[PDB]
């Protein structure tokens, strides 16, 4: 959806993205009430391939409609700067949000966040969309603490292309996906387990100061991240289920959502901690 630039008012720069700024603004179109939007801008000094790469995130987002997937409002392409407009998520990225609020949300709140993420992924998997970069930094959070999946793009990672998407995010990535570049919804399930750990650790870095190769070797040698402080054992076990070496043994997203919904219904089960 092409958005007339006169409909857009940019209010403040709130972030930086790969190709330029991220801003908060307002969108007002004839016949509709004004709404708050995030705006990614792409200014001069870019190649056409880069412009197409930029806008591809819009194309992809525009293919989806789900309350736990960032909603596209439109694009500005017939003037400068080139812009992508989405719904505005007041609390930004989940990892930084949790770090800011370390220890200040209950287990049930955190499980609700995880459920929202899992429902977003359930939807993507149903649509045969493999995310490939599922990580707490790519989950955005609104004023009601609703979590939505962001970061959409289909570019092969640097390792998949010519000898001579960015690099594979090793700490989030399933071992078969690192080794063979086989990215499936089941490798996304591995990543989801990492996101669970991030959330229950209030945004600690997965594997602390281990090197990428240290992480690769540890996982091959049966190491798995331990339960975060005060983490319910049932959640840690769901993480371990997500981190099965055999991708076919991992829960699919409908099962993940089901598991989390049961926890929510039976919050006594979450009292058991190591």
Ligand X SMILES: CS(=O)(=O)c1cccc(Nc2nccc(Nc3c(Cl)ccc4c3OCO4)n2)c1
- Which of 10, 22, 107, 210 touches ligand X (CB under 6 A)? 22
39 carries a ligand binding annotation: no
- Residue closer to ligand X by CB (options 60, 210) is 60
Give the DSSP letter of residue 34. Answer: -
Q: Which is nearer to ligand X, 20 or 251 (CB)?
A: 20
Among 75, 89, 124, 147, binds ligand X (CB under 6 A): 89
Q: How far apart are CA 233 and CA 17, in angstroms?
A: 36
Q: How far is the CB of 113 from ligand X (least distance, A)?
A: 15
Tell me how far apart the alpha carbons of residues 263 and 267 are, in angstroms, rounded to a whole number. 6
Q: Which is nearer to ligand X, 14 or 218 (by Cβ)? A: 14
Annotation-wise, does 159 bind a ligand?
no
- Residue 28 assigned to a binding site: no
The CA-based diameter of the chain, rounded to the nearest angstrom, is 60
Cis peptide before 34 (omega within 30 of 0): no
58: left (phi over 0), alpha (psi -120 to 50) or beta: alpha
Active site includes 133?
yes
- Is 133 near Mg ion (CB under 5 A)? yes
**Which of 147, 47, 5, 169 is CA-nearest to residue 87?**
147
Residues 46-65, one symbol each (x = binds ligand X by CB under 6 A, - = not), give -----------x--------
Backbone torsions φ then ψ of 74, nearest 5 degrees: 165, -170
Q: Provide the annotated active-site residues.
A: 133
Binding site for ligand X (CB under 6 A): 14-15, 22, 38-40, 57, 70, 84, 86, 88-92, 140, 150-151
């Amino acid at each position: 959806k092409e958005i007339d630039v006169s409909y857009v008012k940019i209010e403040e720069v709130i972030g930086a993205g790969e190709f330029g700024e991220v801003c908060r603004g307002r969108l007002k179109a004839p016949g509709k009430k004004e709404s708050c939007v995030a705006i990614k801008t792409l200014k001069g000094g870019y190649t056409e391939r880069q412009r197409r790469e930029f806008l591809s995130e819009a194309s992809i987002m525009g293919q989806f409609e789900h309350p736990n997937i960032i909603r596209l409002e439109g694009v500005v392409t017939n003037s400068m700067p080139v812009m992508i407009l989405t719904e505005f998520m007041e609390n930004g990225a989940l990892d930084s949000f949790l770090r800011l609020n370390d220890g200040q949300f209950t287990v049930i709140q955190l499980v609700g966040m995880l459920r929202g993420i899992a429902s977003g992924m359930r939807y993507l998997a149903e649509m045969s969309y493999v995310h490939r970069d599922l990580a707490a930094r790519n989950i955005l959070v609104n004023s009601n603490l609703v979590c939505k999946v962001s970061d959409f793009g289909l570019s092969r990672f640097l390792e998949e292309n010519s000898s001579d998407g960015g690099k594979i995010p090793i700490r989030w990535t399933a071992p078969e996906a690192i080794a063979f570049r086989k990215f499936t919804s089941a490798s996304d399930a591995w990543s989801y387990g990492i996101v669970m750990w991030e959330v229950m650790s209030f945004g600690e870095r997965p594997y602390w100061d281990m090197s990428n190769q240290d992480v690769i070797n540890a996982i091959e040698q049966d190491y798995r991240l331990p339960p975060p402080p005060d983490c319910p054992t049932s959640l840690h076990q769901l993480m371990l289920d997500c981190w099965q070496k055999d991708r076919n043994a991992r829960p699919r997203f409908p099962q993940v959502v089901s598991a989390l919904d049961k926890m929510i219904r039976n919050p006594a089960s979450l009292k058991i901690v190591a």
